[PDB]
Design a protein around this ligand. Structure first.
Ligand SMILES: Nc1ncnc2c1ncn2[C@@H]1O[C@H](COP(=O)(O)OP(=O)(O)NP(=O)(O)O)[C@@H](O)[C@H]1O
Ligand SMILES: Nc1ncnc2c1ncn2[C@@H]1O[C@H](COP(=O)(O)OP(=O)(O)NP(=O)(O)O)[C@@H](O)[C@H]1O
Ligand SMILES: OC[C@H]1O[C@](O)(CO)[C@@H](O)[C@@H]1O
Ligand SMILES: OC[C@H]1O[C@](O)(CO)[C@@H](O)[C@@H]1O
Lengths: 296, 296
């Protein structure tokens, strides 16, 4: 089977579990603290690997002990690391994550460490014939548009059944990312992006943004407890309710779990309605568990 | 001049500066992140060194790069490290500190790493003749009571002007620490401890706890924006208003700055009223500055 490639950034999540959300200006004893490999596209590889899809991760890396921790972790999941881009400057970014044990909330303090991003030129080296699906985590959009253009160009020269399917995620409310709406077969837009653009529900977001996707695309917007919606070319609004666990313990990476699961379901040939439901079910199962392993 | 000894624990503060206090379940970009040597008694040594008092720090240490960072930092301040207790298990504890750039608040998530504490037996090795003042950060009280007993025993055999002056801090609302109230010439009790015991002001706390200190002792309770109070044997309540800076930027270690400053003022022979005022002034100056260096 051909692999699913994810392009994005691995992050070191340094996770502090507390029994309540820290009141400002207090001192609180943490229940525990752990390191966990993170990053959106990186977490999606974890879930795709767990679901049984061969996959490859492409991101920048800076050698060192943090590098070794996260790369060792990806290897444990049998994620193909062929296209790691080693950088000679900067370092693996760090996210300081507070998990409220009472609600499973996650609050993320993020700190850029100036690691250079994967470039269009880096991407030119990928052997596209190896992949049946390529997922791109939106970050340095002007370069990513070039990567997406290279995939399109490849696709024109292939039969309908050998075309690489493409998804993109637009998760941060940053202007430069919106151009990515117009690329890919599947476009994931976050609730945060939606709300930043003045939309109040997944349905408003989809109706209000659909005109920006490429002809034939499916636009997907997950909305936490309210489930997830999608809108395709036929104009039909699709929805799944959320499937919460009996007790929500850890929502760090729930959206990434949703994304990977939708990608997997669609790549298996399932309908958008089915993918939305599967996505919500796996994400909801993940929320009732620490980390990712117990989803299967 | 004889030194001032502080017994306590060095902590690595990993500090994230943000422009607002993180809303639960959000993602926020940090303005910056830095390492800073911390720990109560450890921060007090920093300030005493800056004020021009020769001092020594005694705490547990676990070799490694964190150790090297904090020990190198203490050496920069010319703090005597003769009595470092090297441990072969556990590691230097880590405090994850969120500083709200808008208010200077500090919110501390603390994570024990099972480093063994300094013991009464460790303390027996100290050459008491070297010190004119010994400050003890309240932690493992049953052992610390033994250290305090050894200092008392030493003192009985010395002239009034060669007696070592002693202070203790009771900062955490933990039962085992309250026994320490009955030791030392100067007893610092925190606002947090006071409020945990049902007191609503520094004055209520002092009137309500004075019966627990040893005959002749001065009990001190700092109350942030409301200044600091003290109560000695003569029954007179003493007070200084706070001296806030024009802009409060960083209150991490303000209490430790207050403690060190009161200790310094008293060790120089100043009155309790003067020490309280000096303590409030140096602390307030420290609050308008990142870290400690600019206080002098
Ligand atoms: N609290 C919850 N209860 C039940 N299901 C949830 C909950 N939160 C999220 N989900 C499911 O996860 C899907 C994706 O959640 P999303 O709103 O994308 O969270 P996220 O902030 O992107 N997670 P993270 O990857 O850490 O950023 C939602 O559509 C739900 O189906
Ligand atoms: N916001 C403030 N404005 C002005 N002065 C302050 C302020 N906060 C503290 N101070 C001064 O610092 C003294 C000690 O503050 P305290 O209430 O002990 O804070 P703290 O929580 O122990 N600091 P830290 O060492 O990080 O735990 C107070 O008595 C004041 O004199
Ligand atoms: O992108 C930074 C952060 O977002 C996440 O990927 C969650 O989706 C975290 O794992 C990572 O630390
Ligand atoms: O004791 C743990 C924490 O308390 C402080 O000493 C402040 O008084 C911090 O510097 C340290 O990280």
């Amino acid at each position: 089977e051909k692999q699913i490639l994810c392009v994005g950034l691995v992050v070191l999540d340094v996770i502090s579990l507390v029994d309540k959300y820290p009141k400002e200006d207090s001192e609180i004893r943490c229940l525990s603290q752990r390191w966990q490999r993170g990053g959106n596209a990186s977490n999606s590889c974890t879930v795709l690997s767990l679901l049984g899809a061969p996959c490859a991760f492409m991101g920048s890396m800076a050698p060192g002990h943090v590098a070794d921790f996260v790369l060792d972790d990806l290897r444990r999941y049998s994620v193909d690391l062929r296209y790691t881009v080693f950088q000679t400057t900067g370092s693996v970014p760090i996210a300081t994550v507070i998990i409220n044990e009472a609600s499973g909330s996650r609050t993320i303090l993020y700190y850029d460490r100036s690691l250079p991003d994967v470039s269009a030129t880096d991407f030119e080296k990928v052997d596209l014939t190896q992949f049946k699906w390529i997922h791109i985590e939106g970050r340095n959009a002007s370069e990513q548009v070039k990567m997406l253009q290279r995939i399109d160009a490849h696709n024109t020269r292939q039969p309908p059944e050998q075309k690489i399917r493409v998804s993109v995620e637009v998760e941060k409310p940053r202007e430069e990312l919106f151009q990515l709406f117009g690329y890919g077969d599947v476009v994931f837009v976050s609730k945060d992006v939606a709300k930043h653009l003045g939309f109040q529900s997944a349905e408003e977001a989809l109706r209000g943004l659909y005109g920006r996707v490429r002809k034939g695309a499916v636009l997907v917007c997950a909305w936490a407890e309210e489930g997830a919606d999608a809108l395709g070319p036929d104009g039909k609004l699709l929805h799944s309710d959320a499937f919460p666990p009996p007790r929500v313990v850890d929502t760090l990476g729930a959206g990434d779990t949703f994304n990977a699961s939708v990608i997997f379901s669609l790549s298996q040939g399932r309908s958008v309605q089915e993918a939305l439901r599967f996505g919500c079910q796996v994400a909801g199962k993940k929320c009732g568990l620490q980390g990712f392993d117990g989803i299967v």
